[PDB]
Description:
This is part of a larger assembly, with three copies of chain A, one copy of chain C, one copy of chain D and one copy of chain F.
Chain A: H1 2-7, H2 9-29, H3 45-63, H4 70-98, H5 104-110, H6 117-123, H7 152-173, H8 178-187, E1 208-209, E2 218-219, H9 222-229
Chain C: H1 5-11, H2 15-31, H3 59-67, E1 72-75, H4 81-91
Helix pairs in contact in C: 2-3
Chain D: E1 2-5, H1 20-29, H2 43-51, E2 58-67, H3 74-79, E3 85-96, E4 102-113, E5 121-122, E6 127-130, E7 132-136, E8 139-144, E9 152-157, E10 166-170, E11 176-177, H4 187-194, H5 198-206, H6 227-234, H7 247-251, H8 268-274, H9 297-309, E12 325-327, H10 330-354, H11 363-366, H12 370-382, E13 386-388, H13 394-402, E14 403-405, H14 419-422, E15 447-448, E16 454-455, E17 461-469, E18 472-480, H15 482-486, E19 490-491, E20 507-510, E21 515-518, E22 525-527, H16 549-559, E23 573-574, H17 578-585, E24 589-590, E25 595-600, E26 604-609, E27 614-618, E28 623-624, E29 630-631, E30 634-635, E31 642-643, E32 648-651, E33 664-669, E34 681-685, H18 686-690, E35 695-707, E36 742-743, E37 748-750, E38 761-762, E39 769-777, E40 790-803, E41 809-812, E42 817-824, E43 840-842, H19 853-868, E44 870-873, H20 882-896, H21 898-902, H22 909-919, H23 930-939, E45 942-943, E46 958-967, E47 978-979, H24 1004-1014, H25 1017-1024, H26 1031-1042, H27 1054-1064
Parallel strand pairs in D: 1-44, 7-14, 19-22, 23-44, 33-43, 34-42
Antiparallel strand pairs in D: 2-3, 3-4, 5-6, 6-13, 7-12, 8-9, 9-10, 10-11, 14-15, 16-17, 17-18, 17-22, 19-20, 20-21, 24-32, 25-26, 25-31, 26-27, 28-29, 30-32, 33-46, 34-43, 35-40, 36-39, 37-38, 39-40, 41-42, 41-46, 45-46
Helix pairs in contact in D: 1-10, 2-10, 4-6, 10-12, 19-20
Chain D binds a DNA/RNA duplex through loops.
Organism (chain B): Thermus thermophilus (strain ATCC 27634 / DSM 579 / HB8)
Function (chain B): DNA-dependent RNA polymerase catalyzes the transcription of DNA into RNA using the four ribonucleoside triphosphates as substrates.
Family (chain B): Belongs to the RNA polymerase beta' chain family.
Amino acid sequence: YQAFLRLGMEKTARLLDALKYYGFTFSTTSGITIGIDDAVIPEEKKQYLEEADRKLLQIEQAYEMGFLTDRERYDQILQLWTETTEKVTQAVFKNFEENYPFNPLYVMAQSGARGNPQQIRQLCGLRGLMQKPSGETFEVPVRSSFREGLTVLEYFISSHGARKGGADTALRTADSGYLTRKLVDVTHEIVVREADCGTTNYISVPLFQPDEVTRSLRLRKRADIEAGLYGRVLAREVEVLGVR
Amino acid sequence: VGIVAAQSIGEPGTQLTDITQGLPRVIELFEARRPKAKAVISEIDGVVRIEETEEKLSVFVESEGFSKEYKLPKEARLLVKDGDYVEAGQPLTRGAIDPHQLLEAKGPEAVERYLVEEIQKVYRAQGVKLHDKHIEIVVRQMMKYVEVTDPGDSRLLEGQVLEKWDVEALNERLIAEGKTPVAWKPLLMGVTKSALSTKSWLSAASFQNTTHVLTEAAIAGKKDELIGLKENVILGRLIPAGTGSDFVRFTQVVDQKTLKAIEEAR
Amino acid sequence: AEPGIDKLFGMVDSKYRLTVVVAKRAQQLLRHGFKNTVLEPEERPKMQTLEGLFDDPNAVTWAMKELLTGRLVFGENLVPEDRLQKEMERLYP
Amino acid sequence: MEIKRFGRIREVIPLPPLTEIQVESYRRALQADVPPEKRENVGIQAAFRETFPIEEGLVLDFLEYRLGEPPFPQDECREKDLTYQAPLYARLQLIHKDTGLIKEDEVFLGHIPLMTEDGSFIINGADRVIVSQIHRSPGVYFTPDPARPGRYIASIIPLPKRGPWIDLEVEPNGVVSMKVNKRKFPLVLLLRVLGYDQETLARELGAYGELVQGLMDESVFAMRPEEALIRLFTLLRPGDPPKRDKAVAYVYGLIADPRRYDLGEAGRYKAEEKLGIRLSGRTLARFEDGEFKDEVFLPTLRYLFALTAGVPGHEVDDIDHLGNRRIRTVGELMTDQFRVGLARLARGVRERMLMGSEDSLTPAKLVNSRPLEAAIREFFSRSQLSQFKDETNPLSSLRHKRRISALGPGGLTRERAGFDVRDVHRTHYGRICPVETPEGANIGLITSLAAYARVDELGFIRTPYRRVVGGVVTDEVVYMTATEEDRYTIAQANTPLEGNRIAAERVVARRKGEPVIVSPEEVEFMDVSPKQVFSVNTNLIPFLEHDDANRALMGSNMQTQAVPLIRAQAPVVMTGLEERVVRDSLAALYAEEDGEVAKVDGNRIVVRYEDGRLVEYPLRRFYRSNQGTALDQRPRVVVGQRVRKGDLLADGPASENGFLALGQNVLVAIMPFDGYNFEDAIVISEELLKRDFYTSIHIERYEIEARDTKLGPERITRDIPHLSEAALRDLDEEGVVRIGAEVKPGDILVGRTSFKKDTSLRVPPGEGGIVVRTVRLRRGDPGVELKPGVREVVRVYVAQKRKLQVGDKLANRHGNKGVVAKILPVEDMPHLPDGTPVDVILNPLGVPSRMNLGQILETHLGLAGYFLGQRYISPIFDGAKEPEIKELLAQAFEVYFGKRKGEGFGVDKREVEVLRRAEKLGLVTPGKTPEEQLKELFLQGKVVLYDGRTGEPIEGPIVVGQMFIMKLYHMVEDKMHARSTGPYSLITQQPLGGKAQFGGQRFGEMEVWALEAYGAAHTLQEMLTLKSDDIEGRNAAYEAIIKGEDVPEPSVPESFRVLVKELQALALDVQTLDEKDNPVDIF
Amino acid sequence: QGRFRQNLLGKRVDYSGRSVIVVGPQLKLHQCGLPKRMALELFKPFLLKKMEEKGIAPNVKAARRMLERQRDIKDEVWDALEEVIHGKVVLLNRAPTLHRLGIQAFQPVLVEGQSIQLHPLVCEAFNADFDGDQMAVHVPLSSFAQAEARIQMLSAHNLLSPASGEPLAKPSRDIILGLYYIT
Amino acid sequence: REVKLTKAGYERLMQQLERERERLQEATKILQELMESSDDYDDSGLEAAKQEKARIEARIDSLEDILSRAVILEEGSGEVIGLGSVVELEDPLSGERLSVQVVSPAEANVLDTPMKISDASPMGKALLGHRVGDVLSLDTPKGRREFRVVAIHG
DNA sequence: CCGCCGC
RNA sequence: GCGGCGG
Lengths: 244, 266, 93, 1083, 183, 154
Ligand SMILES: [Mg+2]
């Protein structure tokens, strides 16, 4: 982006090819590959699962006494894992950051290359919560990692989700850019022909967002603010922090 | 730009699979509609006051002398409370809003800004990063038509192009005297209907019904001013946009040798 | 990418403008003969099987190459429509 | 090669007859192998008894149905486009009111297709498959109400489609709601009709409900009993005679509407258990004694009131539970249409009872095979269920042979409603693969069935389990019905056992689709094997346990598209089913009984059994598969060999040695190259092309007909009207092209002449090859069905060798799919310390995002097998484990590096250098000897590899191994038309194609926009003009280019012109105008 | 499918072609790998003329027969083709044409085989991976069409996305991977 | 209506919303990268990232709902067991001591110091409205055990 | 959405 | 228009 604004269009094209060339070469000589051992399981996984496991017995003994409602039991257990799983997440990463800075699987993920934190976790840590047919997530988590054999049932259970996702990708894909269609229908006559139109009736782009937690003025996210102001033309002049 | 905006908004639609959203929210938004979970907007701008329980609750915007009664079912979720102010078109219920109502209460400059943002809302939550420019270009066309309440040329039950009226009114007060004000009412037609009833006949002959379109365009000897990609496509002529751009379709190249050579012809 | 496309863009008030000039100019390069150039001396385009790009490979390449320099002029209404093509045939064999 | 398998879960019983679905279904469908004395009770015969006892007085009864002389043989049916059907007739006797006379005789009523030993059919020429079907098994269910969260509604559903859809609902306002076919009426109204009196009714029904105040309400209509039958009739929408015309009521009685499903288990099962108890007859049928008996009605409501009252038994029925889902086996499907034909025939015969002179009418006068034939024929050739047999490779056809579809009749399931059905339901366990479903629209709706999944008496896919008593596991297996499985606490097979005794305290089990940790004392049933959880198709992926279910699918489906390679190699690492697939599929040919071999021809194999019989087994030499793939049987037995019973005599299409093989095992380095394996590209070593590693044979069947025009018969001769002799060489046989000739694009394959001319089957642009077989059907047809007008037909088979090239796409069983980007010279591709170079280089990057470690596993084990020279068999969830692999890899280090020490040399300066970067990487334990180090690095599954281009190592061990990869039915032969100009439609002016000219890609508006946006003015103009409609534009364009000139400027597109006129043709007057509003001329 | 809906809904193009795409690592965003054999047919007319320009053929009809059945045409016909394509470019299209980048222009560099070599960086623009996806290619006939095609339509000129001002020539997985390991 | 929480409950829940906010911003990035990735498109990547993102957004909505209209009751003093009250129950026979604190359904958490039990919880229902000295029972899977409100503490 | 293959 | 596959 910087190169584009700074040195011009085609020159940037040159740099891209440049990066493209080196990136690739260095890529081949770097010697990066995947091996089942490359997906390293954190020693603490056996810990956090045990810690969470016993913790599950407390929740059980607590209901087998009559303290927690049928529902409370459930919600509390999910919470148990929802956190336990996230715990194991940062753990695997902590292990790579401190011990194997140059892990193939890891390096791939960190670098904009490939892999996603959530996936990395399904290999080294463990993919834990997969929901039932309807939507209500399962009570038991998928204790395994892909590194180790994902069990018979854990697999089956996980199946439900993969299928719902496939169905979703279907009817959503075949929509055939339906919107690209209608959009085009109402904007297919809009074009740019002009001389600085004289009418100065402008739109003021808001820099602050109202309520979500309650009434409290916040600074709209960096992203969104950009979206509304980037490449725009100021209606009227504005002295802000010292610049005109 | 028309295209470019339509495109940038369409591609992303492929990944948008109580309150309801996703593509449907995008279709509901581009199409002026009454969403699933409607939220009663406040038509009057004053302060708020409630009346609790009773098989029905009630939110009341009252001030100077009148209060706009809002019936909030015993199963609604209202977040404005007994006490403070509420501008026209402010969410009195929780959830989605209805454009038409919001247009009446607050006004147009609000509908527009509502649509734009409420649209972005979905793409943002879906990772997509598209410039507001585009949602704007579209939305603008959603209100390029207005109704008539005070006539001068044609009768007051018509729905015609907003700008075509800025021409009538401009020359009715400016060039030719007799200030016959052409009072109009901003109209929020849906994206689809904006298209449906798009001024040029050529274009109509394409989607709706080719019979009706030509029928009417026949009677009033219609002159299709060739501007717009669709209509001009049929002509098989160079599109009014791109290189066809009236701005550059006519450009001449000469060499200092032949230029002084035209002076040699003089 | 392209040779000084940056420079080119900076010479026109609008993108599409560039294309038009570029094109029509390529037209004149072949229509009124292929010698209607302005930078044929040392430093004219070229190919690699032999040095024959000196005659007629790609027209546009020339155009742009010629426009990169302050030789040609382009405008909304520079020269009367018909008179242009008449004078050109006369001074170019 | 030694074969070592790591299975530790005692696989108790062998897999069932994989194609049993179809096979047995047809056998029992039409019991034609055994006599009528013990003739069946279902299929054919049942459908017969159904509509046979005819009563119009007339009386025509069924005796015996016999059939069995197949007009012609299989192959003949294929070469002649003939449908392989059996002749079917039956003895029918007509009894007369004149008790003293009767008539027996036989009438042949059409031909019915037969089932092949593989399980496929042969309709019009080609082989087709009748796929299974699923639906709401005609029964009675109770589901919650739509909007009103209040109470639930009752449903009564019985096929066929003619049968009424009944529902039962209770409303606030008042009483019952029983809506049949778009309308509702009082539930009592009918009750009264039948005999249920206010008194008796209320008592037994509301003895616990209080709703009853709903039924006993008639104080006006409830005091007239029969009259209520007439009352109900008035409630029919149509105005009709109130004279007791049971008719529409006769309809929902016993005959048509409800069901004739076998009495006892068909619908009754849904009865007895689910609700109520006993069934009388077949359905709510009893129109006997003036009064009616409906032992079904009150119960349905009798459960409604129980449902809304207490827990008499909690019946909330889960629709998708396979226990209320039946699967339609071929048989039921064919039999179904059969009884429809039976009905259609029974229709005319009754008409022919009043139509003629009494005894003057006999069999013929009552029977016309017209109905039944069109009936059956229509199903096999028109029903949306019978399809082309996907035979890319045996496995493929086999899956397509057993997959279940939801869409079909339309009365079972449609298109726009499926989010619910698409999910893999709880009950799909062992009954439906959760992986076999296809990607894209139509997902989860069409899927192949499980391993041991076998259809029972009436559909409900049953699965096998192992009853366990106390801490003892048994071999006594039971095939449970989806519903029955919920009653028990079943446990997994992974449960450690000491023979028959469990081994752990907290031993996993699943109550009802719910994971629960149970005790050894509560384990009532155990899973047979992990296999049963998936399909055959899936059961073929090595380390499935390490592969994300989403990609596993891609992996299963990809095998279905594997293409037969000349050199077939079984996977260096197998699942354990490869043997079986080739076996129950009928690719290879086995030996029936023990004996010896006689002749081992390359066309036939004759063996002598030790019992006293010598048979000649011909081998389909080189046959054209449905998908155009080679199908040859290559004898693997030598002359005079003592063969064991059930031993491979010859190998099938991809099954070499008797194992299934599709693609080959190649040495592969898993690293990144320049960019040749960028997103999903693959790099291949020219070395592969050299040993014809990846080469498949293909055949294209071009067909030409000698049509009979009223302008003069199109003769087929060597006479080529335009004077060529150089193009008439190959065409030596007067008319036909000679076998063994080389046909290139544009040569004449077959000649023909027609009226004002040369109309000859030519080699369509693309390619041809070598003509290998030819078929001509002249006048005196032996037993072929030549369509009308069709004088004679000519078929020409052409084939060629497919060597792997850059466009081709391969992929492994795990899901890594990709196309060949560059074919590298062995010269400079990744070679190992010892001269051995790799075959293919997979880009690492495609493994993390997608989750399929399974491949990286297979590769490790595959590495051991290379230097250990051995193939392995790793079970689904029970296969090889990470420790055992490292063990075999350790063995492999002594072969790789061991021979290295003796041969005379040590470590390279290169090997040492990569070891430095490896220890600094944390792959090797610092401080150990290079020898020791490399071993530890090899065990990781990574070795050292030198560039090949530079001879310098690739800093960092790289993993390598034998990965089993296949070539897909994707040749680039179907992927590239290059059109400069040619034929245009004569109706619309479009560059359509046909024979010599390719077509032009469409441009659609979706792409025009693309252009518009760019500001691509002329580029767009060009696409709508010079390239499409301006007949003068494209003309000037062509010319100009011929001239090396500058294309002319566009004149008004004919579309503009054509519009002005179309507008002139009517009142409308479209006039084009100038600057100052004045005229302008297009012409 | 009437007549008013005819001029818009679309149709098939002359001078078109389509094939399976394959990654071309060395290739620069500027160019694109196109199969000579395809180019031959694609640029047939343009080739014919150049054939007469060079003694290879006496006339057009001759040049045509010359390509009617003859197997190679070796270096010379090829020398001519490669000469005719000099600075011309072609367009490429991807399966669903979603945004303006759905079609980009590249300079063809003749190559062996069947597949079409595409630049890695543009693989993001056209939703296109190499598991068998196929792209269609077109040719700008007019010197005006050619102009716009290579000026405002070429790949290297459309770096930024019209959607957001963010780049679309972003380095993908492989490149990044390398660049990172080295820094 | 109204949701009641303790000052401790408020802080705990408020912080939870904060943490979930950072998680939502991180799940965002990932999703954005995937959508622009489009290399090995149409796979688990998107559906997974979007699904995870959803589970998050849901916990956020329920957190922002409860926190926007909850009341705070300052009850360190009083006698009867009410919301916020930390009771201690002693099993008669065995003399087993138990520490519990009844709170609104949203504050419940078996992981807290005194086990936070829902107001609308069986055990939570039985305890509300009683004082030091009281004796009561409820149903339990193994049977029914009565406890005596040992003392009521702030 | 675009491309193909066949009654 | 029906069916099958690919992106
Ligand atoms: Mg793809």
